[model samples]
Target chain A: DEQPEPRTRRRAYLWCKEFLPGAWRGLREDEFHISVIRGGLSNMLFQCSLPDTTATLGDEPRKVLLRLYGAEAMVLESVMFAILAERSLGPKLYGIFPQGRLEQFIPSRRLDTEELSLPDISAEIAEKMATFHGMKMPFNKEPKWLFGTMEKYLKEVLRIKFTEESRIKKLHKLLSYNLPLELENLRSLLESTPSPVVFCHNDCQEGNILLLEGRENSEKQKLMLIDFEYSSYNYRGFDIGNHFCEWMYDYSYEKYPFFRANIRKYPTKKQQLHFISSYLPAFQNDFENLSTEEKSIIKEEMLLEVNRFALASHFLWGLWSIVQAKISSIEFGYMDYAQARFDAYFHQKRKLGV
Target chain B: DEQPEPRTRRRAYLWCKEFLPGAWRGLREDEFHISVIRGGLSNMLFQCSLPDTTATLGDEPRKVLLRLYGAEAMVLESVMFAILAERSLGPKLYGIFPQGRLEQFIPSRRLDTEELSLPDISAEIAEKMATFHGMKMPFNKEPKWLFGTMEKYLKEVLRIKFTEESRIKKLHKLLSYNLPLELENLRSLLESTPSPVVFCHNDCQEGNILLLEGRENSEKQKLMLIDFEYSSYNYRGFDIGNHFCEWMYDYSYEKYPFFRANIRKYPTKKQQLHFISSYLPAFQNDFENLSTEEKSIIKEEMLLEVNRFALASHFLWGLWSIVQAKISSIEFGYMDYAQARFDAYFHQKRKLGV
Candidate 1:
């Protein structure tokens, strides 16, 4: 387990004083507790909170997140977060540094795939995700959303610096299994079924969505989307399709070859209708309030579009895993993840029937 | 021209979040600026501030210092700062860390020899100096005050790392210039004129005293001492002597052969009487309040004590510079500084006439 060190903790304390001096006033080092919140491979997210004190410090919020990231992600996330916070779509950002950021700590729990599968929650996720897509972000607007990024990552993976000779050989073998023909098919299908570019949470997986407080045991649970490292302007279908594809396998329990077991949990037509009805504004509210014929019609159109777009998600993640396999210092099996994505790509491709 | 870097600035920012969360609320990177403060040989002091805003963010002070120091001074300074801030004798220590600290920024100017020489300021300095001495610090209660530290630094300097061969030969020549005999006399004299142990600001030179704003243009300036990096539990005389020795030649302008012209300006007898009268409480407030015989006796005793302690200051700084020459990565001429202190040692010693 990667634990926070005292030296790093103290430096973080000093950083708070530098960036947020007004809010940090009169606060002693011992008054707050610093602990690891999310031990992310790309960035270690830590929460510094005054758990014991109900007393607020003037206008200063008592809890904030200390997000430690690498240089590669700093600038991208900075621009992404700045827009997100300013537009009131994501958590408020406090300060940004090259190494990390002090972000607003949303008092919430991470929604895994299981939590996201609930009908009400799934509907909520769709609604909130649409809002994310609605945000006018400052990223470059281009149609090269999936295939272009894939090609870029593919070039880099060719120059991978693998520590283990065996891992390299395994990756080579896995990648050699007619991967090129499958990716070409993925590109043509995405090209044929293109949608207008919008601000997309390109990686809208389970762990990125945050749920704050249950609503009266269920009415309006405050759903927030986070982890915008891959967020950019892209096909709206990719974001939607990615979420749907994520409905399958859990990545938590793999003992070896970390990406092997993703139990296929595709949503049924009814559930897909429930999700899509909440997503498109034509039936944003009171989907059940509509006539059965109208509901079925909206569901029919959405289910088709989503199923077609699901191939993009597989292609996108496949390329991402390939890139990550080469460069990422994370402990997860990127080679296996890439292999799984490749597998999903052909599986989804055959269903699209090109 | 030691300057602040982005990486270091961010680390310092994180430290503030860890230690002082309440005051750090809602701060953005664009709202504040970080710049170099006092770029000392041993420590790089930086000020992080909202230069444009006078608006209070709660009850928090607007400015704080990001003090960067090396491993050699971290632990020692942490304890010193804690006790000093606790006793209200030094700047409020916002946080402590391995690399540096976030300390309260006093809006003031550092006083040098000229500023310290003024009658009122000198008196104010004495008052504050005694208050600091009176505090109960947790430093080792051993008598390494002058001689012990000198001997240790001397050994290191002899094995000093040299970048230039010429500089090495120069140091060798200076070291062999009857240095051992002079140090022997210094140890003997300190042994003879021992005073009770007090918390000494071991480097109480003119630069350490900070002058704050006065009530009106005519009102006397408020004095606050700063930089207790070399503070320790030692004789009262060493602190007072170190301060007085700082009154001699300015090292700010000297180039190579740094000891050449010290412009020995030891205080006159009457001036010594004036300073000593202010320092000792038995004769404080009113020198004329005591009998003529009593006044002479008090003045005579203090004059002898401070003058002798001033010698310890020379010896202490000399050794400090010597060690710094070897280990410090700072841009100052430590070799020159050592040479000057050694030069002053003999010059002051001749006057004392051992």
Candidate 2:
């Protein structure tokens, strides 16, 4: 994560200036500005804007995101982002480069764990999920997407040779303890249920869900999904499960490495059913019309299905953390994150006894 | 590197607002703007701006850079940036964090190839190097600094295991070809010549030199060196030679992994003397009064010394690139850069027969 140097900035600025001539025409290079907009693991977001003098008079756009991408995500991420943007499921793609993309910046805040659990908001998130899942994507049109990505990270973590002999020994012990049991448990359970494949935002954490200001705050809240780096076709259950697991943790704090690991506050049984009921739609508009008795029965079946699928979410991130511990430069402690995730995966699996 | 989520941004904002209470008290999170300032590899820099309303009226500082540091550089870089700031050799340090430092934003651009060659500007840069080296530093009174650090990289690269069979084979072939001869050449030259170590900005490339706005429309210009991540104690010659090597190449371009390799542009004999005579001083002021005959004799001697040290620069970056090839997530061609550096190192040493 090197900061872009002035040459790169000037190049980026020149590109923006050409794209937004009216806004940038008379401005000095110093007057046009760029800031880091938030994105997740795969890239840095550059929030580019014009000074108010240029802004107050021009027909040019106010802000855009320059998302510089990272390892292993180039082809798939762009293909999905292009399709999703076209379908109005994510931010609009403004331009493309092998290194990154120009994106429409959302003027909003990411939703919090608390914001995500309210029945109405959760139901709406479910609706948004259903809308995207209905799409035909380019690849991974099966249950394998979630596990296949996990296997990719697994192979990398296994291949890495650590300079710290202690870490090599520690990783050997940790992997030996978790990988076999977790993989076998995940495989058999997923193979048995075999939910129908659908496009998934496999990383639908609260960080990816932005709450935009809609109209004049007259009670309607608008939410948009961002960061499509991990989106792919996968089991419909996996998206629901992954999002539900995200409801359990808050990583923002002053501390190093350890997030305030908050697994105790996972959604209640009633909350899960409410989310599941909203999610299992026959048609986007028709789900709300189902009778309460019938809805309750459907919720029960989905509650069981989503709970089991949540284990896949745990295993996926756990393997990811293991690989990241070996390579990622981000300051968060990937080793500790791996342990926390895999431990949760084992505990959840044993409790469910699948 | 993963981008920080909005929650993290809000946390960063709250911390900044509290730290700069005079500037940020009344502003909502939306009023505060943070744009990323570009730096090279290692960390991201956020250019945090106060609201225009506050900026136009209040005593608040207009902007500062939140430089989030990276792996292996947090402690050493902060220490160097702090000392240099206090000495007026670098930017002002506004606030400090375990994760990074808040820095005064220098409204200027980095020096490029043409700017670095301008006689007056290059002389000022030589003056800056002289000023810093004259200080009593915490390290590098012995010849171990350059080779010790290179040894550390050598160990890490040797230990890493590549999963790509082709990469593994290619790397094996590359190391077998270059490492043995380079190491032997480096060790013997150091032991034989044994230049006294001095405080060194071991990475004094053009990218690290910023040309700030000086007097309006006057010929006078101001230059400052930034990015102390690779600053350390080493041979006095290493800084000068490394800088000359930098003058020859531009790494910033639209190409992949390859810097437009430009060794042919290495400073000419006349330019080298102009640089060397300015750099090697008896006393700072006395340097101005040296007879041309005395200057020529000293220049010839310094030329021989810098030429030998230039080989160390190549060896240093050559090994550094090899290590980066194994571990870096920065999307450059590290493997190719390693080969380029090592190739130059061998060529430089063979020409010198050391």
Candidate 3:
């Protein structure tokens, strides 16, 4: 359903010539191909490529991903992308320009909601989560990004004054609960939870995780984390906990409400422990060879931290969706999504006895 | 003599807001400062900064170098800059856009023509050159860049038809030398000389080298190589040899000619050997512990390679200056510069007996 406007296609072609080098140098606008890449929610992603007949045989890439800024320019996010690109942890950045950037287009498929909960896929995702959490990025190390973003989104949510009757009803339903008090309580709860501060991929949903098409048989490193727009220094538990929350929702339902949230599908205690075991080894050099008792003790502590932080992820995204409901043009049921996430946030808070 | 156009200053201010982050974000156009950075010859350079009154205390850089492309958009050069910046061999690239890039403004002084020949400064330059030459960049490994660029310049030279009498006179004098035959002959002579193909800073003049101001009291690593517009995979000797040719010409002259060439100022045999001794150790892992006899043999071989390539340097610049004489708007005596370079080329050819 997603498609690029004709003007955007023309601009993307011109950018390919300006930003990319080698074979992309001599292409005419007509010779370039621009097609919409569908998973992006807040931004527009287009796959720009040259005809096979025009492509040269060299190390130069034939295809590049062009991402146009949607809401606002995320300068810090672009900086993070460049750093990760240099370290070989993310896609190679071909060129950065005013509206967007040209990036390496990995021939991969987004990990669907069904595939995300698979035992093997989940383990690999956990491993990559650990790898990113271990990185010392050039960002403020204080664990404030989560609350800061949530507070900003809450302010935007409070500002919305819907006029349409349908929209007004949804807005009233959202404001019925004391959202500000809930955010403050959650912040207090997370303050008491012990989690090390580290770089985090705050949005680790299935839509952002790509499983390389040709690497199905590979032993490791098939899953890649993309869309670092929400990434920053935060509690390590938030990243892993947020990823677990993703297992309960599917955004690909092509009907009214667009997404389905089945809280009963949340990872069981055994599944959480399995993911934690795969992730914890990267933090300790001798974790693989640790005594069973020592490993068990570490995993138990991480289990508590992850479950507690899961509530923060739900609250943050609930506030996020409320703002999106007011501002976003994308045709998703943002109000319904917000209600589901907030419901889960309260449900989990009671379950965790926080 | 050099200043930004009012329109350019306005565009640069908008770019700083769009490209730069943190303290540069909230400043108004009047709060931003844009001034000319004088050394750039082929491109326009400006120092963009925010008023200290509006600045914040953070790791974010307050000042950035804005380089707008002059003649053409150098896509390959921009790629090389990104790579070198990532490796910390060049300045940090803050942001890139359609027309140009924002770069880290290192507070340093450009190496002057006279200071380039200073014994201590020359040794450090040689060491930095060795480090760059040793890098394996992601470029075509064939040693075709030197001849390819010379041939390109030669074609452009042939196309120019001057109408002004003074310009015509200089053009005729340059053409009288049988430029095509000289290029072919130089290519043939260098084909027999054995020079390792490595990454080369093809334009390693004094203007492109910077000595960080605060580091004068520190030992080693005080010098940095910048402006990689002419860098490519080429014969190692060309870089060292071209630097030697730079010792003869001072570009800072304020008179009508704007630059002065002194053939006698070229590095002497003892000086060339001193540079080679410091350069060769980087290639050999155990060179510092090598016997004096082995060191002597290595240095002697390098001395010959450097001197031969020095002739290539002279001939290539001769062709380059001829083209620049016709098209360049920069206030320099391009015709006089070409004649002087060719004269040196012929003199060096006779001295080398090739």
Candidate 4:
């Protein structure tokens, strides 16, 4: 059932076909060879050396990487959808195969902290992201579905049923009062806002941006938006908010609390506003033709939505964490979930004067 | 001699001397007993609640500290000398008593990371130190002894004994070359820059800066320079150079190959120039009267002397640390000293372009 070697080649073969529509049969085993680079809890990327003599893409093997994951299920298709929406707000799709192989030979490298030059890209790269998020989606996917789908695996096997001491049971009670409110708040924003939905990379941390060794100051490498597992026809506001919260430290210390392990630097709040403001002009069209009152409400609502989304994400994570820890018998990070759940909930109450 | 039921009212006694220098000698044993708040390596400060509290001041017990070791060996006096210099250029001094236990009684709550204040009193404080250095010595005094003497003991008694060992003989050799160099450098600076010497509190750290309790801004506290152990006729450059080196996050981090400590956080060059320029003006005689070329040579020579002084300090400390560790029957911070020595040596090469 777990024959990963065949799975790697199969995924790579399918990826080559999906990259170019109506050209699925064109990829042959002789044209490309797949080698597993790394596999972990999240996903696995299979390196597809395209017509190359070397296994590691050294001199010039036909170079294409086929990233694969187990039980990828709908996440892979969602990413493929994002790729399709690339030119029109989705990730540029290399192609997706009939066998559910999603492929894109993106000329991108992971951005590191040592990147003193990329910060120089403040002039244009951010606008491209804004433009990407502004594109109209083919389908009107509900934002709540993204969080809801992730909630499916909240529980373990029924055989390992909930016990009194189980964290899930405790979380069930704690979240009973909180989960509904946070989810509803975020859900209301998605439903009420008229902002157009586009493909989101789903993860926009520093490491996600790839650089090419092409030329100094010339961005030869493309901006590779990746990990589109949560990609869907969601409002651009939420995507931008999430990226702001996650990748804020990359540009400035004041941006987010997240630490950049590579550069070991934080973005100042002044630096983070540049990104937030940059995205605003490019996506300002989302509020066009709407009443001024509605626009103001949307801005306020989107900020609250971001706060609610964070609370809900943390709450949701905490709830599932209890279940996961109870089964695995690991308890360290469970307290963190508990503290996060309570901190966010109470901090909100004080901020909102609830 | 160490065991006595001393009340904590001792700090108040020292505070009483703020207005009445004679109060430092008052002998009302039970009229002022202090409970121990905390004690330092050299002195014990008490929450002094004296019946004869300064009639002009409030009746609440003042933080009266008793400096020990100074009258016999004057360890704290050296610290006070450094503090006096700082008061002249760095911070405010409340009042200085040539012969008494000194306490600044800073009113504000102390900080954990003292450098947390991003930008404040940096240039201003250095300018102030220059003012102090510029003032003429109101009284004549000899340079404090014991540090050089003790350093010699470390090298001769402790270091010579250990260098024969197999593991750290190189460490011993390093120390041998370092001690005499330090003594000579300190002497060289003294001879080279004897323009005019003023009263200097040889140890002016944040801990010594007494704050006027009701104030938050820099304007309120009345600074009084106290303690006179390390007070000497040495060059004024010692005042600025020593403080800057310590504030630069210790010699180790400064000396690291790729020091991630962000030395750029402080305006090093600007701070140095500001300190020196402002300091020169403080001299009673016009600083500009000297030939321009002479000033340049002196400044360059001052920088070279300090660099050499740093090496000497590194060497002395490296050797002293080992002797203290071994004689105490414990292998304490030898590696730390070794690392610091290496870093100091490296910085020397960098400064010298060697």
Candidate 5:
């Protein structure tokens, strides 16, 4: 009679309690306050404080990025990732609090979108960034097969277009005839591109690329990239594309106040170039699908950089479609803003006429 | 772990609690009582005293009648009969209590076997009795297939011969073969015999049929048949034949020291005539297979009656076998007694040429 739900809940509940700090183990009350953390839906922000604590705009203290897990199964593994990061086992994850009620941090100085004008991230921060993202991947160079099960908690902001119910059964169904096939093809392309299986931040926008200053400009600067939850292994260009997309996102957010008038931010071309250039160290290969030197001049004219942009846009669309399908489509209320940004990033007209 | 035993108990519980109670919805808790009040095992009876402070020893006092629900599905109607007895509606039942534990009054003295001692139940009681029993039959005749699901409680007592467990399994398996079919073929030889659909006490032995003193003793005479718990509409021969079998049970209490000594209660010739004659009024037609002349002669023949005694023994054995089967073979505990008795009574060995 206790069909399936109770069994899964019991497993996850017991799993959480097992590794929870001894301090937490003995606690019996139903709710607990977890730390404030800025989650990825950039402009839409929050700060987690104890529910009993009251706060307003001026008093809001440091907000550690956070997300919610109504059902712990969604974040069940992430808990392990935190612990792994704690033990310095996988990534050097700063301590992650449970994604309970609240966690939002937004700096009041309000970063300018044109900051896409900044240079490549400092070496020190990049090294830390590399370790964290790289460590998430398996050490084995070749795996027989990668097995993953995907479940999404989608939210539908635009319910009519996406869902018949309060939420579309998710854009997943809509994309079945359309983009799901493209998703697989994209994975195959990544496989063929031989993007040496290193980890890459699939979302490295300007806001996400943190600039940690030593005591606010006394000297030492660090670009600690904040969110890596969406990190995964893929074509190096796609990873770079995500960062470039972020950079361009900031630039565009400034140029056109269309989204910004409504407080929505986007990327610009210069910043897009900046996002793309960041990956030159990791991806020096010219992303050239070329053979036969006789067409070298024509191939040069074909623009390797722009081709990379097309590849990035392809990756971005697939990624956004998934986000729309999963996050915004279900009533889970969480979403990847990167989806919207990438979606718009791909919105530009394209025609190399190849 | 609890498989077999639990299954048995469940069946027993189901038999008593659901089927029988459901069948007899109108009966109160006590009018159905038969054992402790001075008569039979047919109705689960209890004596209900109406607080007679003036009652003297052996002196009748104001009281209510009570009987518990009987085991058989068909017999559940007995509760209504009890209430009718009080209103003198059909018969003079004093009171009716349907649901309660059966109370049995232990006999201070086991009736002896020697004397010709059938309880001298009289004519007046018989008049009221005649009114109570024959209700409107659904089709105004014995239904073609009378299926009685007696409780496992009563059935468990039927297994008589083999190991209790083996007997129970045998009974179960045998009953799994429908009882009506088995009887139909066995009695097939009597095809022309009028199957009188009368209300007979399918098991009307001395224990069940009682001789009530008519109107306070010396001047009174009455016969009230009790124990309708095991009563059913069937061939009247089965009732008489079963009584004959019970009479010959030969309880050799002190003599055999194990069984009752009342084995030889009547004259050999007299006993045969008693039973054969008792069955005569029940039929007024040629024997089913025997020609009228053969049937008439056989009715008078002492040898034929003796053959009936053999059939009576078969009934006892069959009854014994089902009890053995129910008690030990069933997943349930000892239960389902009424069906076992009915089965045993109807399935006489002589009927099977055993």
Candidate 6:
């Protein structure tokens, strides 16, 4: 069911009352309209609102987005949100508790996969990504999160002994690749590349980006990236590369597996250059102001880094999907997704000559 | 025995290297001087320092206080620390992880029990306390933490069936008081009183307050309160009254029990008035600015509220100690401490006519 259970609704109601006291105070649980907000694959999301009769004309928000954590290091996530909120890079955090937090529910819509490739939107995303990459998150600068997470997933994958015939076949295929060795080789290769490490939104897919309704024409404020669950300090290439990888997958596919992966849909050289050119000016000097030689050298170097790290992104997600296949309650075909990611990883590895 | 184990030291070394990268980068685990800082009863604390050879004159701190969580709601504490750090109300947070955090270790000394009662220091603490009490912590302001915590402790206390003869005797004595009923009664009574609820440093004892060494003569800058594990939004009376209760006890007593509580050491009316006078000005219009009659009425009203809440302060610790007696590995005599606090609670209840 898309709706939250009565118990969850009750908890969300109590949480809203506790955290958002001013407008939410003196209101009964039944007074709240708690509805499930779809599109979150990992965790449950609920939009809580007050009845119009009780709504105030005050500064207090009438609605809040309640997010229940489906994952952790929860402390790290909470800290990241607080920092992001303080910096105005993310949503205003209304209240934080153990299981979830109440956030200012912006009236916005998620960008579709097709919109992610739109010129104006892509450039905005690029500019925001550059600004995001420049953030000094109080975390380990060494890009351990990527490899550490993959290693964790790999261990989980190794522990699984598939039962069903097709599952067993898939598992055997996966085992034949020697993922552990592949991961080590990938790590060695990627680490040797000169990718400046920075804070990264490791999952910079379309669904995570929100286009705030009625926002000004100003490009920077128009698009906001949400869902910081996978965010951490990592290689700059991994973040940009991962974004490029996301261009090929459409999670909105209405089918059994519930996702569509088209290898041909991956960003072309011209499209990548456009995004990179927009990104470079934010961190480096203005792209238009730079000498042609300087711009060419920087863009080419960045493109190489991004394409190489895309392989790591694919490998990481492939291992992640295998683990998810065993544990996740989500209806997506995780094994199929894993196979696709691994296939892409191999294809990209060959093309990149890594 | 006071020092961390080799394994713990190794973890601390690695943690610092990860979190405090600028100052701690390129240093081997063997090069770190990891020593346990004493006086923490709950969590393990270590002072991690770099060797002089690597210490730079940069802004990056050479030393950091590493605190490993021995308790939770860990997320709440981390968020609290981050907010406090941002506001400059607490130590600068260098890094945060699941198990622990790296904090800016100020070169300072903890306030001893005797210093807690000194006129100048007491006044400074009072002013600081007023500011602390006025803070708008993004927490529920319903004063649930106080009663909820007591209820939790009481439940744990009830679960235990003593094995030892002396312990059995003490347990029977505790049972006779009907703590569950007392807690309910106390909550009902305190909830009725118009105690303006605000964020509180619930454990406002001497040990938590640090006198930053080689600092300015300015009173505000000198005293820095640390250890926010117990801090939350609650009745202002509870915070003030708890501090008053603390004056009677000294944790520095070099005895088997490792603490001394003398009823006679409780703050005198004149002394409490002195503190209230210092505190009132920051929140209230200048105490000196008020008319003589206005000052008298305000002071009298505040004194009654503080004294009434002192009963709660005693009861909370009494119940807390009973639970600690069952679970805590700390060397202090928890049963003895429980008895003393319970006695004080009864004594205060009678004197206050509550």
CAPRI-style class, candidate 5: incorrect
Off by over 4 Å in 2: A1-354, B1-5, B38-42, B55-60, B70-73, B214-218, B281-283
lDDT of 4 by residue, B237-269 (tens): 445554554453332233323222233332355
Best by TM-score: 6
Q: Output the better candidate (1/3) by lDDT.
A: 3
Tens digits of per-residue lDDT, candidate 6, A1-354, equal 366878888888888777775677768877888888853544678898898889675567898898886553677888889878877899988888767788879888898898878888899999889888877667876678888988988998999976768878887898799888899999889878889878899899988899989873665668999888888888899999999999999888999799999999899999999999899988765567978998899899999999999998999899888888888778888899999999999988888887
Chain A TM-score vs. truth, each candidate: 0.85, 0.86, 0.91, 0.59, 0.47, 0.92
In the range A1-354, model 1's lDDT, one tens digit per residue, is 344778777867765655453346445776656888776555777877654654665565577888886432344455556556656777866655556778888877777777768988888888888888766432345446567777776667667767888777867776686556766866776677646567788877778878785542657646888888878767777788788888875666558655444536777677877788778763254566778888777667666667777876776677777777666776787767767766776776666575
- Winning candidate number (lDDT): 6
**Backbone clashes in model 6, listed as residue pairs:** none
TM-score of each model, paired residue for residue: 0.47, 0.47, 0.62, 0.35, 0.30, 0.85
TM-score of chain B of 6: 0.91
Instruction: Give i-RMS (Å) per prediction.
Output: 18.6, 23.1, 8.8, 37.6, 36.7, 1.9
| Per-residue lDDT of candidate 3, residues B159-259 (tens digit) | 99877789899988889988889889888878988998788998899889899989987777789999887787789989999999999998888997898
Candidate 3 ranges with C-alpha deviation above 4 Å: A1-85, A88-354, B1-14, B17-21, B27-30, B38-42, B54-57, B70-75
Q: Estimate every model's Cα lDDT from 0 to 1.
A: 0.68, 0.70, 0.82, 0.45, 0.37, 0.84
TM-score of 2: 0.47
Query: Sorted on lDDT, highest at the top, how do the candidates line up?
Result: 6, 3, 2, 1, 4, 5
Q: Candidate 2, A17: how far from true, in Å? A: 57
The sequence of per-residue lDDT tens digits that candidate 6 reaches over residues B259-333 is 998998899999999999899997765567879998999899999999988888999899888877777777888
Cα deviation of A288, candidate 1, in Å: 11
Name the TM-score of chain A in model 1.
0.85
- The candidate maximizing DockQ is 6
For model 4, the stretches where C-alpha displacement exceeds 4 angstroms are A1-33, A40-43, A51-61, A72-95, A98-102, A112-128, A141-178, A181-202, A206-208, A212-222, A247-272, A285-313, A316-354, B1-354
How far off is residue A211 in model 5, in Å?
99
What is the C-alpha lDDT profile of model 5 across B137-156, one tens digit per residue? 21112322232222232244
